[PDB]
């Protein structure tokens, strides 16, 4: 049910990013969708990424260090994985949903990370 709702949300974020000409605006709309347990990491390209502001956050390094997440990122493919993340005190297991998006030829990714309650 976390997957269902987070996968739905991810694709909306995808629609939003893809259908605004102004990405900075599309990001500010997007951040309003992250709840106290969910955070978002938008990765447009190698030099450009942006994090939902403030337990549930995920970095480019945490992604590149997950072989299944990194593959998805590299290969521009959707991924749904449940895992603890690397290099964090908050090693709590999270649901993670990554979804590709494209704008003006700029292929990007939107990763969503949700804290899993015990
Ligand atoms: Cl990046
Ligand atoms: Cl911030
Ligand atoms: Cl520690």
Attribute tags:
alpha+beta; 5 strands; 31% strand; binds chloride ion
Describe this structure in words.
It is classed as transferase. The entry lists the keywords structural genomics, PSI-Biology, protein structure initiative, Midwest Center for Structural Genomics, mcsg, transferase. It forms a monomeric assembly. This protein has helices spanning 2-18, 23-31, 60-64, 67-75; strands at residues 38-45, 48-51, 79-83, 94-103, 106-115. By secondary structure, the protein is α+β, with helices and mostly antiparallel strands. It has one domain. Strands 2-1-5-4-3 form a 5-stranded antiparallel β-sheet, sandwiched between helices. The structure holds chloride ion (3 copies). The site of one chloride ion (CL) has 5 residues, from β2.
What are the SSEs and their pairings?
Elements lengths: L1 H17 L4 H9 L6 E8 L2 E4 L8 H5 L2 H9 L3 E5 L10 E10 L2 E10 L3
Antiparallel strand pairs: 1-2, 1-5, 3-4, 4-5
Helical fraction: 25-40%
Based on CA atoms alone, the radius of gyration comes out at 13 Å
Number of discrete helical segments? 4
Largest sheet: 5 strands, antiparallel
Order of helices and strands: HHEEHHEEE
Based on CA inertia axes, which overall geometry fits?
A: globular
Bound molecules: chloride ion
Protein name: Sensor histidine kinase ResE
Extracellular side: 1-118
Function: Member of the two-component regulatory system ResD/ResE involved in the global regulation of aerobic and anaerobic respiration. Probably phosphorylates ResD.
Subcellular location: Cell membrane; Membrane raft
């Amino acid at each position: 049910e976390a997957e269902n709702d987070l996968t739905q949300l991810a694709n909306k974020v995808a629609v939003i990013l893809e259908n605004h000409e102004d990405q900075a605006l599309a990001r500010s709309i997007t951040w309003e969708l992250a709840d106290n347990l969910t955070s978002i990491a938008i990765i447009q390209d190698e030099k450009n990424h942006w994090y939902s502001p403030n337990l549930s956050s995920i970095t480019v390094e945490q992604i590149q260090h997950d072989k299944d997440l990194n593959k998805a990122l590299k290969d521009h493919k959707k991924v749904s994985k449940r895992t603890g993340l690397s290099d964090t005190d908050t090693d709590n297991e999270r649901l993670i949903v990554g979804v590709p998006y494209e704008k003006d030829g700029k292929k990007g990714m939107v990763f969503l990370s949700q804290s899993l309650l015990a």
